Amino acid sequence: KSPRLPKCARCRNHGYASPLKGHKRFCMWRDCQCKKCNLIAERQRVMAAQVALRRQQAQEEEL
Amino acid sequence: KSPRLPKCARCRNHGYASPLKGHKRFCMWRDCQCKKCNLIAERQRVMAAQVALRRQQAQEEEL
Amino acid sequence: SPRLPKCARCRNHGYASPLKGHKRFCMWRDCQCKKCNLIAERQRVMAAQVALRRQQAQEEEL
DNA sequence: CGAGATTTGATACATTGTTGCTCGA
DNA sequence: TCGAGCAACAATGTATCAAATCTCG
Ligand SMILES: [Zn+2]
Ligand SMILES: [Zn+2]
Ligand SMILES: [Zn+2]
Ligand SMILES: [Zn+2]
Ligand SMILES: [Zn+2]
Ligand SMILES: [Zn+2]
Q: Cβ of A10: how many Cβ atoms within 10 Å? A: 19
Give me the domain span that covers residue A21. 1-63
Give residues whose Cβ lies within 5 Å of ion ligand 3: B 8, 11, 23, 27
Q: How far is B58 from chain C (nearest CA, A)?
A: 11
How far is residue C3's CA from residue C19's CA, in Å, rounded to a whole number?
12
Nearest by CB to B50, from C38, C46, C49: name it: C38
Closest residue, by C-alpha, to the C1' of E7: A51
- From B53, B14, B46, B49, select the one nearest C48 (Cα to Cα): B46
Give the type of residue at B9.
Answer: A
- From B15, C34, A44, A30, select the one nearest C9 (Cα to Cα): C34
B49 to chain C, any CB pair closer than 8 A? The answer is yes
* Total count of domains within chain A: 1
DSSP string, A48-60: HHHHHHHHHHHHH
- From C41, C14, C9, select the one nearest C25 (Cα to Cα): C9
How far is residue B15's CA from residue B35's CA, in Å, rounded to a whole number?
15
Q: For residue B20, what is the DSSP state?
A: P
